[PDB]
Amino acid sequence: PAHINDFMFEQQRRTFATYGYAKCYLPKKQIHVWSGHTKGVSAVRLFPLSGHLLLSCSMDCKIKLWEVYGERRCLRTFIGHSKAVRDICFNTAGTQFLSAAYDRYLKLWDTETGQCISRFTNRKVPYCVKFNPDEDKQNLFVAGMSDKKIVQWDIRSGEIVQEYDRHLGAVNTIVFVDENRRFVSTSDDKSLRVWEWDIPVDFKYIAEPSMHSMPAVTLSPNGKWLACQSMDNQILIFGAQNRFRLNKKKIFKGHMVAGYACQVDFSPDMSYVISGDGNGKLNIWDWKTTKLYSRFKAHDKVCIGAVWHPHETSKVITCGWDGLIKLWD
C-alpha cells in the first residue's frame, strides 16, 4: 500500500487532467360444397324449412351465404362480424338469424334481404347460440358463454332475457327440448345438465366424471333419445327424460374424437347415425341395431362435422371439414 497523502495529490492531478509520466346403405360422395373458404369452417348451418339454403360459417370472420341443394351454387356473401364467429343460429322462418362472435359480440343477421340484421354484444365470449323452440315469437334465444351460466337473451325488446348458472363449468352447448320446460345443457365441466330455463331455476345435473366435454350432442327427431359423442371417442346415447330413470338409451362406440367438437349426423329412418371422425374420416354408423355401419374416409383434413337431409326416406347426408366441405349421397 502507498501513502494516503500521495493519493490525494494524485486525485487532485487527476481532476486537473494531468497526464505527465515524469344389408346396410352405402352412401357415396355426391358433390362438393358451394364455393368455400381458406379458413376452417366455424359452423355448419342450413335452412330448417327449405333445406336447400345452407349458411357456412368460417374462421375468416365472414358469414358465407350458400344456396346448395339442386342446381348447385351458393347464395351470397355476408359481412359485418367483428371477429371469427363462435356459433351460428337462425330463426324458425329463416329470414332472421343470430350470430355468436368470439369478439364476445352476438350479431343477428338478416339473410334473404341480402344483408344481415344488427350487431350486438355480450358480457363474455359466447360459447353457444341457439334459437328458442316452441312459441313462434321467440324474442329470446338460448345462449351460453364462458361465464358458465346458460342465459337466454331477449333481442327485439332491446335487452336480453335472463341468466342462470346450472354448473360451474363453462357451457359448451345448449339444445332446448320440445317440452319447453327443459333445455339440455352440456358444459366444459363434462357434466350433462338439463336446465329448466324459462323459469330462472334449471332442471338437473348428471355425469360430471363422464361424457368428456361436449364434442357432439344431438337428439332423435322423435324425441325418444338424445345421443352425445364424447371426447374419448365414446358415443353415449342417453334415453331421453320423462321417467324415474329419465336418461340412458344405449352405448355406441367406434368413432374418433381428436378433441374438436364435431357436428353429429344421423339417418333418421329409425336406422342410422353418422358423424365425422377426429382423424378426418367419415364415420358411418348403424344405430337401431345397437351397432354401427362402416368407417369410410372422405375428407383429407380434420372433419368439422356433417348434416343430413330432411326426414322422408333415405336421401343424402352433407359433410364438412376444416378448410373444405363435401356433401355425400
Binding site: 366444459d188 363434462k190 366424471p209 366435454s213 364434442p215 371426447m231 374419448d232 378433441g259 374438436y260
Partner: protein
C-alpha cells in the same frame, strides 16, 4: 357377502378412491381443456400463455 368381498378388494380406501376420481376427473378436464384449446389454436392465432 358379495359386497363384503368387493369391499375387501376395495381395501385401497377412500384416499385411493379420491385419487382415482381425481385422476379420471383430471384427465377428463385436461382432455376437454386441451381439447377446446386445440380447437381454438387450430383456427385463431390469438391465445394467452397458460
Amino acid at each position: 357377502l358379495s359386497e363384503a368381498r368387493a369391499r375387501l378388494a376395495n381395501t385401497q380406501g377412500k384416499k385411493a378412491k379420491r385419487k382415482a376420481r381425481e385422476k379420471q376427473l383430471e384427465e377428463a378436464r385436461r382432455l376437454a381443456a386441451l381439447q377446446k384449446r386445440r380447437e381454438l389454436r387450430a383456427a385463431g392465432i390469438e391465445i394467452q400463455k397458460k
